Amino acid sequence: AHKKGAGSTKNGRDSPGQRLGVKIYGDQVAKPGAIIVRQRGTKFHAGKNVGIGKDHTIFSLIDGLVKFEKFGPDRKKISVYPREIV
Amino acid sequence: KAKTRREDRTARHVRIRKKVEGTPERPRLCVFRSNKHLYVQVIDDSKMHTLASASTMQKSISEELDYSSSPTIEVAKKVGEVIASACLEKGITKVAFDRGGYPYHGRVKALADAAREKGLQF
Amino acid sequence: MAKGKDVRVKVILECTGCVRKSVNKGSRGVSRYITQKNRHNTPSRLELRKFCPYCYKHTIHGEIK
Amino acid sequence: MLSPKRTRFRKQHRGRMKGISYRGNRICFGRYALQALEPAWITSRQIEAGRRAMTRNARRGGKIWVRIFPDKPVTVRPAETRMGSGKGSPEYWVAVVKPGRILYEISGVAENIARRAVAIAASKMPIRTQFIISG
RNA sequence: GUGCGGGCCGCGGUACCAAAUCGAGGCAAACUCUGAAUACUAGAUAGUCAAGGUCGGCCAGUGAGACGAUGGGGGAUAAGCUUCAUCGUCGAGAGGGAAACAGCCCGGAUCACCAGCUAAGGCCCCUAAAUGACC
RNA sequence: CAGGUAGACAGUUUCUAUGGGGCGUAGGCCUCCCAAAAGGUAACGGAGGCGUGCAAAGGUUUCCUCGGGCCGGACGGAGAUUGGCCCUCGAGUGCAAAGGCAGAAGGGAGCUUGACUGCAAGACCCACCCGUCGAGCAGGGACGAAAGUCGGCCUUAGUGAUCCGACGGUGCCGAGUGGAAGGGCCGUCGCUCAACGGAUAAAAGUUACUCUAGGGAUAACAGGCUGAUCUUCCCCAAGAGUUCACAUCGACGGGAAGGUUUGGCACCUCGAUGUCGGCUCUUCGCCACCUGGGGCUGUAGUAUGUUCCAAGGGUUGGGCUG
RNA sequence: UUCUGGUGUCCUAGGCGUAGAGGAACCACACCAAUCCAUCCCGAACUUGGUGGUUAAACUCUACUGCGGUGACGAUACUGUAGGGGAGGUCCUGCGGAAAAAUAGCUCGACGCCAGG
């Protein structure tokens, strides 16, 4: 059953909290960064909720997936070198 | 004494919305009314520029009574139609519904409806 | 029922559509496909919510009067 | 490097005296001063035995100022093995006295009387002390 | 320093006994408005390395490792002590050097050879090599 | 046949983690730090929580947005209703905690109730199982004028597979045929199975009678490393010593030596090195108590106190108790 | 070119405080309000129909360097790599990188589309 008495906390943790891909790259419709789950949808990389200045990627791939609080949410579309023929 | 930050009016009337941001900028429709007249504008997006901008006064030039009332709802639809038509001729209907401060039946109810008379349909 | 370490039970009921079936189970101690959980003690009784079952779409739902 | 504190939920890790980086104060209050050379765990029984001694050879004179304050607790093991962390209050508590920082301060008196005063105060300190003046 | 109140006679007043606030001087893994090296991810290029990098298939072995340097928890920042991360060595490679010390340093052994030049460490004798020059 | 009694007898269980074992405590998930600025990464290392709550604190549309304090007012004498000013994550978020948030999930109201079915490009997280996010598509709805949102609740825990089974649907099958029972498939329920990746439907102790398989990687005597404590010495120094700090001693504190105390380590020995004490017989070193040579002495002498060199030598017989 | 309104690229060299100043051509107050609509109390705020007056406030400019903020050179801290010392448990040297605070100084923004004088 539930134990009680003189003792401190226990059990370690791991989200984890890293960053997938990065600026200037063929960021596919995966999930860049995603430090925390439940990240809303975003048709691009990110660039908000931080120091002045927005981020941008050289190539995109139909929507994406980035955090909701940090880096994001969704605003303007960015994609250097138009993905078109001729 | 101590600097205080207060969110401006145009920052609490729920002006900017999500979804529509699917594009760098959504084709909003500047339908604001002053303290005497009303100014309409089909501002484009991307960076700037617009398709067609009309006003209550400008209409007086085409065909309207001189000392005629402007705040009247009758003029609303007139200001929404004058800005239209030519706006479509510029290329293709690229106007949406954007207005934060008019309780639906505001002085813009005719402005948005006027757009549904030239081609813009949703 | 009185909450505590003794004799508890998850107040989970069902919501069968009016004169219909599917998207719901009917037995002694079974729950619907959506598995609804009422409060029992808290003023409830008579549950219902228009849901979309198998046959056609959207009905009434809400069994146990 | 300690002074009268107040009750609180004080009970954290030990810590670790790092480079001289942090400490690097100067001489603000009082004419002369006294600095250290190497960090350490100064207990309360050291600062008190050094402060009273600073005025012990004076008695009714100027005023003593303390530009320091302890923080890093001190946990000690009784005599048994090692089952858990120490208490934190068996003997006392300390902090970190890195070089470059100022300790005692004396003023309102002559140069000689303020010179010997720091002498005895330096003896109470476990770590070597450097005597300065101003400028 | 200013200052609601509250202690001692009790309204003039009084040692900061003592909250906020202004100026000056500090501490913190869970403080940090700011802010390196470095690590890592990704896009090109010149070479170099006798595909090392990746996938699938057959047979393995091994899960109580130790030590030194460096960055941190435990202990008094006491232990070749213990528990993690990283690099190297031992452990599955001698030898040269530290007198003798596997883990420290140099260098990392296909073999022969009364063949030379070096690294680390040294050059009075004992085991080869400066009681060499100048201050 | 069957209900009690029934270890007198028989077959077994009675966990582990744990810097000996044992006792205690600790043996999932969720928040921060130690993890040394991409993740990941230990230890009964440092501070707190969960085994839910909720016809709605769900979704949507519109609108509204603090705390606290100062100056005023009938019921105020520190805070309660009102008005004005300063109104600045220092508020409010269902509950711990980090982060984030006032384009608000904050707060209120109406309509409602996607707290939707069937799928789902492309990826994250794990050895695996498993977990998490997700534009768009198909069949139907809710809110708003519309664009448009919603596949639960700000996010992260609020949990647990397998097998045995109850029950509905589904003419899938159903061993001669036609049915049925049963099974399969769709959907749901039962297990503080927590020692919770859970060995049973169901199982506590002793063994100084002990036995066997192994090892000091797991203890006891002891050597060794280390050594806070202990022992010895020393620094500054208010005082005691009438006066006078140090003849003697010496508070508040500090720096070392040595190493026989109390511990840790438990590095080499459980294919073993017999524990203490006494007796017999000694060896060496030193901060040697006595004998000898000296300084100071609040040392007159006779006798002592302290300190330095020095041990050459010598250094007790009994009552009681192992 | 000057002035004014709506919406952006840039978000405290662009903020706040103080002083002055301008427009019924534009924007705000303001007038009226049996209504569509709103106020769980008042049309204060939204909203609707519109003489007069004003532009005080608000807002938009200008001036004024109190309070914020932006930010060198040099030095210092720290650190990768390759080594050397070392009793405080860190530190030094060759080499590369080299901020925070602080100082001089900068500074009280600068522009883009459209419309109305």
UniProtKB/Swiss-Prot annotation, chain C:
Give one Pfam family, short name only.
Ribosomal_L33
Q: GO cellular-component terms in the record?
A: chloroplast; ribonucleoprotein complex; ribosome
Chain segments annotated as coiled-coil in the UniProt record: none
Q: Which domain of life is it from?
A: Eukaryota
Q: Where can this protein be found?
A: Plastid, Chloroplast
Keywords linked to the UniProt accession:
Chloroplast, Plastid, Ribonucleoprotein, Ribosomal protein
Q: Name one GO molecular function term.
A: structural constituent of ribosome
GO BP of this protein: translation
Which Gene3D superfamilies does the UniProt entry name for this protein? Ribosomal protein L33
The task this protein performs is described as: Component of the chloroplast ribosome (chloro-ribosome), a dedicated translation machinery responsible for the synthesis of chloroplast genome-encoded proteins, including proteins of the transcription and translation machinery and components of the photosynthetic apparatus.
Quaternary structure annotation from Swiss-Prot or TrEMBL: Component of the chloroplast large ribosomal subunit (LSU). Mature 70S chloroplast ribosomes of higher plants consist of a small (30S) and a large (50S) subunit. The 30S small subunit contains 1 molecule of ribosomal RNA (16S rRNA) and 24 different proteins. The 50S large subunit contains 3 rRNA molecules (23S, 5S and 4.5S rRNA) and 33 different proteins.
Q: Which NCBIfam families match?
A: PRK00504.1 (NF001764), PRK00595.1 (NF001860), rpmG_bact (TIGR01023)
Family stated for the protein in its record: Belongs to the bacterial ribosomal protein bL33 family.
**What is the name attached to this protein's record?**
Large ribosomal subunit protein bL33c
From Swiss-Prot, chain D:
Protein origin, superkingdom: Eukaryota
NCBIfam families for this protein: rplP_bact (TIGR01164)
Q: Which GO terms describe its molecular function?
A: rRNA binding; structural constituent of ribosome
Q: Coding gene?
A: rpl16
Q: Which residues carry this modification: N-methylmethionine?
A: M1
Name of the featured protein:
Large ribosomal subunit protein uL16c
Principal localisation:
plastid
Which HAMAP family did the record assign? Ribosomal_uL16 (MF_01342)
**Subcellular location(s) per record:** Plastid, Chloroplast
| A single GO cellular-component term on record | mitochondrial large ribosomal subunit
* PANTHER family xref list: 50S/60S RIBOSOMAL PROTEIN L16 (PTHR12220), LARGE RIBOSOMAL SUBUNIT PROTEIN UL16M (PTHR12220:SF13)
Return the InterPro entries for the record.
Ribosomal_uL16, Ribosomal_uL16_bact-type, Ribosomal_uL16_CS, Ribosomal_uL16_dom, Ribosomal_uL16_sf
Summarize subunit and interaction data from the UniProt record for this chain.
Component of the chloroplast large ribosomal subunit (LSU). Mature 70S chloroplast ribosomes of higher plants consist of a small (30S) and a large (50S) subunit. The 30S small subunit contains 1 molecule of ribosomal RNA (16S rRNA) and 24 different proteins. The 50S large subunit contains 3 rRNA molecules (23S, 5S and 4.5S rRNA) and 33 different proteins.
Q: Which GO terms describe its biological process?
A: mitochondrial translation
One Pfam family recorded for the sequence = Ribosomal_L16
Q: What does it do? A: Component of the chloroplast ribosome (chloro-ribosome), a dedicated translation machinery responsible for the synthesis of chloroplast genome-encoded proteins, including proteins of the transcription and translation machinery and components of the photosynthetic apparatus.
Keyword list, A-Z: Chloroplast, Methylation, Plastid, Ribonucleoprotein, Ribosomal protein
- Identify its protein family: Belongs to the universal ribosomal protein uL16 family.
| Free-text description of this protein's post-translational modifications in UniProt | Partially alpha-N-monomethylated at Met-1 (10%), whereas 90% of it is blocked to Edman degradation, probably by trimethylation.
